[PDB]
Every structure is written in structure tokens, then in C-alpha cells.
Amino acid sequence: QARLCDRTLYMLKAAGYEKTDVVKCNCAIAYK
Amino acid sequence: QARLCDRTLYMLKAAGYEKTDVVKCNCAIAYK
Amino acid sequence: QARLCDRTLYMLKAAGYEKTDVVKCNCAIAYK
């Protein structure tokens, strides 16, 4: 599914993130 | 357009970067 | 070929990594 490396996440709330933390969506990567 | 997360940028000079700072180009990501 | 930016690598053993360090494979990015 998803993978959190340091501050960057390669589900959002599952790892403590929210879509105000996503930084890119391929048509994701979240960061905080 | 572009998005700078810590040291990594997901325009270059707009955010203080130059192409000697890009690290990948999908056919970008800059880092310093 | 490959490019190591801080903790993130955009060959594995060439830069001191192993596939237990890869975090994404586009069909790579390693991290430690």
C-alpha cells in the first residue's frame, strides 16, 4: 500500500497524514 | 507549478534552484 | 545511472544499498 520514509510518505490518515500534506499526484507523495 | 519540501523540490530559479540541482527528469525533481 | 540525495537514492550495492532499502519500483527509489 503505502510507505513512510522519514518525512515523506510513498492511507493518509492511516499513517498520520491528511491531503493538505500531499505534494504530488501521479495521474501520490505526501510530506510533513 | 512546483513544490518545495525541505531539501527537495517537486521554476528552478523561482525557488532558488538551478539545473545543476535537478536529480531526475521524467520523460522533474531538484535537490540541494 | 543512479543518484543519491541525502538519505534517498534515485546499483544498490554500488551506493551502499540493498533491496531491503528500496521503497518504490515504477513499472526505483531506495532509502535508509
UniProtKB/TrEMBL annotation, chains A, B, C:
Q: Which residues form the signal peptide?
A: none
What CDD domains does this protein map onto?
A: YjgF_YER057c_UK114_family (cd00448)
Instruction: Drop me one GO molecular function for this one.
Output: deaminase activity
- Specify the protein name: Uncharacterized protein
Similarity annotation: Belongs to the RutC family.
Q: Which InterPro entries match?
A: RidA, RutC-like_sf, YjgF/YER057c/UK114
GO-annotated biological processes: mRNA catabolic process; negative regulation of translation
* GO CC annotation: cytosol; mitochondrion
Xref: NCBIfam families: Rid family detoxifying hydrolase
- Note the Pfam families from the entry: Ribonuc_L-PSP
